[model samples]
Target: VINTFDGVADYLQTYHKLPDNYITKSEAQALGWVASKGNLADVAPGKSIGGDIFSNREGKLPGKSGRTWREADINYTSGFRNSDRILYSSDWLIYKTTDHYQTFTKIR
Candidate 1:
């Protein structure tokens, strides 16, 4: 999982309640494909989220470790420019995966 820590992610994805592999990279890719190319136009649905500081100093995305991430060093302009787009995108999900990828039903 991207946003969540490893323990919870491992549990959700591996729990007997869900499929052994309830979510796969393939699923994510498929969902993205449909949403981007589907008849419905791509919509933001919300505003951008922003983050500047290094969320992880260990260069690890949840469920990962043993990374050698270099310390961040920069200035004012650098701080403003090195923004993370992930935060700004409401469509972006860190770790959680829904059965419905990009083919989300437009209830609206």
Candidate 2:
């Protein structure tokens, strides 16, 4: 049940699920997270960043005509989101990146 980068991937692969800490971006937005400023403390008090649609615009991952992907923040603490993140498809594809989406590694 660790929250490390690898731990998050293992948990997701084993359970095919996200940990309880993850919250949708919209949820955080409602809490007052401006993408430009990354201010989240005012709204979401204790939440892990996640649930934002990830557009595979670079065609980096395998994509179908209708498949959609969502993003989850990894190793995230309170107040702001870090560069580490996990991008998973609606089906079972999963990828991880520590450079804020500049690159990704297929772990599942």
Pick the lDDT winner. Answer: 2
Collision pairs in model 2: none
Residues 12-86 of candidate 2 have per-residue lDDT tens digits of 667877777777877777767897776665566557777678888898877898888887887766555788888
The global C-alpha lDDT for each of the candidates, from Candidate 1 onward, is 0.24, 0.75
- The TM-score of predicted model 1 comes to 0.18
Among the numbered candidates, top TM-score falls to 2
Displacement of residue 54 (Cα, Å) in model 1 is: 24
Error of 2 at 52 (Å): 1.7
Candidate 2 off by > 4 Å: 1-3, 35-37
Task: Give TM-scores for every candidate, taking all chains together and pairing residue i with residue i.
Answer: 0.18, 0.77
Off by over 4 Å in 1: 1-3, 6-22, 33-108
